[PDB]
Design a protein around this nucleic acid. Structure first.
Lengths: 333, 305, 424, 333
DNA sequence: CAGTCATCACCAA
């Protein structure tokens, strides 16, 4: 018995892209007609402020480049001077059926995987995963640099059945933290909805609205476009900010990253905050990888031990494996 | 050969998933062999209950797009494929490559029968269109209608019985219905004509056609020039490799009635001229004409010059 | 007989090439049998595995994956008409590919190395005096080699076809039909593929490109083939098809044969302050070549004037039909044409290249262009096209001004009569 | 009597390519002028999340490349932020003459086959397979991933014989399951029409429109085309979506594959849902071929026993054999 | 004791 050479898992917890608008507090419950924060291109006189190479360090050019200016063109978005509040709105579907692959080569391995996932589900649900996703919705983790030093953050979540709304939550996103998962009774009512979405019991569509009191005319931070394979002249643009039609925006995959920062079960520094759910636990912006292949805690060891050889891990690693299957990917050999 | 009296316009034929290889040395728009095979396949199903004939086709080609992709680091193309079903052991099948393209096409037919005086021509137009909308134009299907369900009916008009002044208004009224297309004719005299530019080298002939559909540049005695048309290499029939076989000889034939040769393609030349550049629209029509005994099979358009 | 070292390099070269095939668990008979039968039994393997293949010029393996049929082996005849040549009038430098058993096309290299070095490729089967002195075999071995080497160029199997073949029908002039089963010209595609690999790249076709890159070039011809397509035969392993490996690798290069008008733009003639009145010229992206040709073909004299006096006779139609195609693919091809923004100047373009009436059709909509004289766009078109056919003091004062303005007059004469029958 | 060495069947049930367009629910009765969903390009930063190859086991490269990022360029198609309903429109020609091959060697084999097909037709017409074609029209199975998590699906079918409509049907596609062909008189009037078109008697031309409420700004899934070996430069494009002119689209063969999921009769394990009609009746997502010639119920065995030897199989295998003639194929010796 | 069905190495810039 081997694992299949083709495995494809669809993503669950599928969010849209979020769009930005601006206004003032005490109008935030009449905030349906706020104008969008716009993308503005500007040009910058600056200074040569990089390290200087010593490999062709001619002092005729290198000692003289410091004294002369540096001209760059960037992009920037701000709040208006009339307004002091960022608004971010996106939607979220919770699908369910989170153990059945969409593409396979074996059938015995598929039945073994489905009965393994059913063994996981019919003694503990998705509740430990669902309340961790409900934590990351309840605080405003998805506001990445925008909440940093924000004075007050409010997160509103609406459950939507038709044109009318069915259930509404309100929060204080700064009371809820980024390193704890201590909750109350109000967040458990969101966790049970997400756990009824992940188990296929119901249809779940959510509208997440976050308000951040930042300041008059201060700078907001939309997502920056990866511009790849250019081959151009002297940096005609060096920062392009992502927008949709006349509205600054955040990519859907960055919000999707912020929702699945669930993993407090990694070996070395589990007391040092949750990271995202990756197969090799890698945080790239910090330049290291928790859950190496050498310490047998990555997904491609635990999955193969638990599905094939009937070597069930600890429950805290079972949550990691089921989180990797809610994520999705190409897990084939 | 026989000049028709009335021409039959098949105005809009949005067809999907046509073949786009058409020979071992070309790609793009399909061969006009498909179009003359289409019109004789109309002949064997409609033209005997109308007692007419339909011989030639006006290939106009309004739109064109091919299911191709531009790769990275290359200036060539590849084709988008289909995914074929699995083999009986569950493994994946091999890959045979079929190029594929969508088209939008107008057609000009030629009638020769007693049904044009036994009927109104609207009967001929309606029956030919309502049967041809259940066939396959090049290798792919013929689509029904959409937002464009206003140009659905045909037209048909003679040219012999009438005045000789406002027929210009009549054929340029026809040209108002095929105005954005580029007609396709046979321009094989220039393949003769570009041997005298190579007569200083050799009397060879197989590399002459590979000289015209590109950008030839020398330096100053940069050398770009206006090419004398939209000149493209098209396929233009079949030449025999093997003698004609009796209808019970060749193993695994389609039919047990017809005789069989083994042939291969011959390549001509065409141009994508607008229909304004030719006065009479009956010049454009493509015909089958091939002598059987020595195996030369060929299609072209007569009456172009 | 100094031509047995080819047999030595075929036997011992392959026997020493099996030095990476080292298996220390079960090679205790494989290595000994390879060293024994790799030399002596190699002639037996090249006799028994010399009859799985054949020479070809009409292969059918390149048109379907497993279509087991019969491949042609003879060149086609000469076409009896003028103006169309192909895979029969090709030169005497042809190359016959060897279709056959995919796991038996290695002895074909040892059989066909005799056309390398010597001139004794036609010494193995017939004229075995070039196979007796350096062959070093007996009469049974020489006879067996001369018998087995004739099964390549001769027939391999029975003449047939397959269900995955094409077999088209062709209507006869006054009879029934012939079935035409076409084949893949392996020889012709090899010749055109080697012909194009020296024309797209190579020494001269790239050194002339560096000569362009040094901006100092004297006239020398290079070639450029834009927008081709590639097709693969086989797949990840193309050696099951005939050869397709020497420098083909399953990559027959297909020349473009596309229509001209299948990559268009969008029609935006809205009610703009310059998108109504300033749009009276037809600013398209494909007229730059025509403007550059009419510019750069106006300086040459009539000292070689037996060819250049037959191009401007068609350029008037070739530029008027472009404006006709623009005005009939933008106005009628677009679903809208509203009132011009700043209608005191943006209304003449809505008059000329405009669609029919719409939901804003008042009383005076089908009573202005239906009775107005549609002949005002002749003088404006002559002024616009007479800006690209520019006048000069050395052109007006010479005898070329009338002989180049008569063409603009004859072009402007008929376009008004053409566009004066849509409304009026 | 021998089997014919050349057999080829022209297909019936010929669909077009679907087209996607976005609008609002309860604005779907004026949906002739919704704008088309376009394919957007985007670039994506990611992590190395595949099974790395220890074939060339390097203690320097494959552990630091876990830490380093992964830059990719894909396609995506979204709804606009003010649209929650996906519209999918295509047309379907049904032809008839569903037992007459397009190429047959012997006319005696043709005579032995065509009266067998007419013997099948006269006692039990095409109505019993047209029911299962009309079901897969009625439940919107051609929305492949676009049904997963949709909240309300509505399918409209119009019989067109002339310039305009002849007969109109309305359906709730989520009330009709993907597994249970429970016939009812809303679509038996459709099944009789598809059967009278498959016979060759009357005209048939359907216009199929499907509405699917998904969510505001969510990601819809048009078809992805196979591009084998594109981009040997690493500045490549991994996913490429299929577009007809300025619109996202689904291939026609995928819609036909959705329509011919008829086969419930396969002998491996029949309680798993209907699969697509195939010779050696197989399924590519499952990676497995049901209806194997060792268990003599595939198409070649049954066709040869039912034409050459007159050994009639059961009626349920006969529906399969006729469904392969509506599907069409290319056969040999 | 003879057809037939799954597997098996054979090649290959």
């Amino acid at each position: 018995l081997s694992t299949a050479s083709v495995l494809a898992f669809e993503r669950k917890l599928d969010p849209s892209d979020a769009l930005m608008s601006a206004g003032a507090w005490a109008q935030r419950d009449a905030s349906q007609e706020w104008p969008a924060v716009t993308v503005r291109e500007k040009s910058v006189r600056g200074t040569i402020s990089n390290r200087l190479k010593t490999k062709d360090r001619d002092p005729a050019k290198l000692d003289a480049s410091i004294q002369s200016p540096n001209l760059q063109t960037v992009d920037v978005a701000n709040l208006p001077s009339d307004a002091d509040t960022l608004k971010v709105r996106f939607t979220l579907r919770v699908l369910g059926g989170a153990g059945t692959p969409s593409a396979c080569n074996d059938a015995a391995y598929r039945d073994k995987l489905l009965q393994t996932v059913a063994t996981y589900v019919n003694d503990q649900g998705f509740a430990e995963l669902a309340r961790r996703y409900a934590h990351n919705l309840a605080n405003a983790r998805f506001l990445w640099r925008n909440r940093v030093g924000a004075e007050a953050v409010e997160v509103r979540i609406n459950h939507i059945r038709q044109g009318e709304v069915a259930r509404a939550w309100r929060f204080d996103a700064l009371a809820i933290g980024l390193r704890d998962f201590k909750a109350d009774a109000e967040l458990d009512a969101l966790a049970e909805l997400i756990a009824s979405g992940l188990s296929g019991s119901g249809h779940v569509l959510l509208e997440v609205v976050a308000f951040a009191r930042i300041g008059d005319g201060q700078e907001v931070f939309p997502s920056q476009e990866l511009i790849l394979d250019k081959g151009d002249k002297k940096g005609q643009k060096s920062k392009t900010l992502y927008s949709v039609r006349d509205a600054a925006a955040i990519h859907s995959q960055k919000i999707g990253n912020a929702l699945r920062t669930i993993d407090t079960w990694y070996p070395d520094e589990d007391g040092l905050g949750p990271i995202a759910v990756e197969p090799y636990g890698s945080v790239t912006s910090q330049g290291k990888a928790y859950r190496q292949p050498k310490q047998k805690l990555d997904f491609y060891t635990l999955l193969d031990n638990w599905v094939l050889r009937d070597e069930a891990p600890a429950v805290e690693q079972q949550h990691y494996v089921i989180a990797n299957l809610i994520r999705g990917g190409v897990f084939g050999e | 050969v026989t000049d028709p009296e009335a021409l039959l316009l098949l105005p809009r034929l949005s067809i999907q998933n046509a073949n786009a290889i058409s020979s071992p040395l070309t790609w793009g728009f399909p061969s006009p062999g498909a179009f003359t095979g289409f019109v004789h396949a109309l002949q064997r199903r409609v033209g005997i209950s109308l007692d007419i004939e339909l011989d030639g086709v006006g290939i106009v080609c309004h739109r064109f797009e091919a299911q191709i992709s531009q790769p990275a680091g290359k200036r060539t193309k590849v084709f988008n494929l289909t995914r074929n079903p699995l083999n009986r052991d569950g493994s994946t099948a091999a890959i045979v490559e079929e190029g594929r393209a969508h088209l939008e096409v107008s057609l000009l037919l030629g009638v020769h029968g007693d049904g044009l005086d036994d009927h109104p021509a609207q009967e001929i137009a309606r029956q030919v269109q309502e049967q041809a909308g259940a066939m396959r134009l090049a290798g792919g299907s013929i689509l029904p209608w959409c937002n464009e369900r206003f140009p659905a009916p045909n037209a048909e008009l003679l040219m012999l019985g009438g005045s000789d002044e406002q027929r210009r208004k009549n054929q340029r009224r026809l040209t108002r219905r095929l105005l954005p297309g580029f007609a396709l004719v046979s321009r094989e005299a220039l393949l003769q004509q570009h041997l005298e530019t190579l007569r200083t080298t050799l009397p060879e002939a197989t590399t002459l056609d590979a000289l015209l559909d590109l950008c030839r540049i020398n330096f100053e005695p940069w050398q770009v020039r206006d090419k004398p048309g939209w000149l493209v290499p098209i396929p233009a029939g079949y030449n025999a490799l093997s003698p004609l076989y009796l209808p019970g000889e060749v193993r695994n034939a389609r039919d047990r009635e017809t005789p069989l040769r083994f042939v291969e393609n011959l390549f001509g030349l065409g141009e994508w001229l607008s229909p304004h550049r030719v006065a009479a629209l009956s010049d454009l029509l493509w015909y089958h004409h091939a002598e059987p005994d020595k195996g030369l099979y060929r299609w072209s358009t007569p009456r172009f010059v | 007989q100094e031509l047995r070292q080819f047999i030595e390099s075929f036997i011992q070269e392959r026997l020493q090439g099996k030095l990476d095939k080292l298996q220390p668990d079960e090679d205790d008979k494989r290595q000994t049998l390879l060293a024994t039968h790799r030399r002596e039994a190699w002639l037996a393997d090249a006799a028994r595995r010399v009859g799985q293949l054949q020479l070809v010029t009409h292969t059918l393996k390149p048109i379907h994956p497993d279509a087991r049929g019969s491949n042609l082996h003879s060149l086609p005849q000469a076409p009896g008409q003028p103006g169309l040549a192909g895979s029969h009038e090709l030169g005497d430098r042809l190359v016959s590919d060897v279709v056959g058993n995919a796991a038996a096309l290695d002895v074909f290299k040892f059989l066909s190395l005799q056309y390398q070095g010597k001139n004794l490729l036609n010494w193995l089967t017939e004229d075995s005096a070039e196979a007796l002195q350096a062959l070093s075999d007996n009469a049974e071995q020489a006879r067996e080699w001369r018998q087995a080497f004739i099964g390549i160029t001769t027939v391999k199997g029975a003449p047939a076809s397959h269900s995955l073949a094409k077999q088209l029908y062709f209507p006869l002039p006054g009879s029934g039909y012939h079935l035409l089963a076409p084949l893949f010209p392996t020889s012709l595609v090899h010749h055109v593929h080697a012909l194009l690999r020296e024309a797209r790249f190579g020494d001269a076709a790239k050194a002339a490109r560096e000569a362009r890159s040094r901006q100092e070039s004297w006239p020398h011809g290079f070639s450029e083939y834009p927008n081709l397509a590639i097709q693969k035969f086989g797949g990840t392993k193309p050696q099951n098809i005939s050869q397709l490996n020497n420098e083909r690798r399953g990559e027959n290069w297909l020349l473009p044969s596309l229509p001209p008008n299948w990559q268009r733009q969008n029609v935006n003639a809205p009610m703009r302050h310059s998108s109504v009145f300033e749009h009276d010229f037809g600013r398209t992206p494909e007229v730059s070549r025509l403007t550059r040709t009419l510019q750069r073909f106006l300086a040459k004299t009539v000292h070689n004037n037996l060819a250049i006096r037959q191009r401007r006779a068609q350029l008037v139609a070739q530029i008027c039909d472009e404006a006709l195609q623009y005005a009939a693919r933008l106005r009628e091809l677009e679903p809208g044409w509203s009132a011009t923004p700043g209608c005191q100047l943006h209304d003449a373009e809505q008059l000329w290249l405009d669609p029919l009436r719409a939901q804003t059709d008042e009383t005076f909509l089908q009573r202005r262009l239906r009775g107005d004289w549609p002949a005002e766009v002749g003088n404006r078109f002559a002024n616009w096209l007479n800006r690209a056919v520019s006048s000069d003091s050395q052109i007006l004062g010479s005898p070329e001004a009338a002989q180049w303005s008569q063409e603009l007059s004859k072009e402007l004469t008929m376009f008004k009569e053409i566009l004066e029958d849509e409304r009026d």
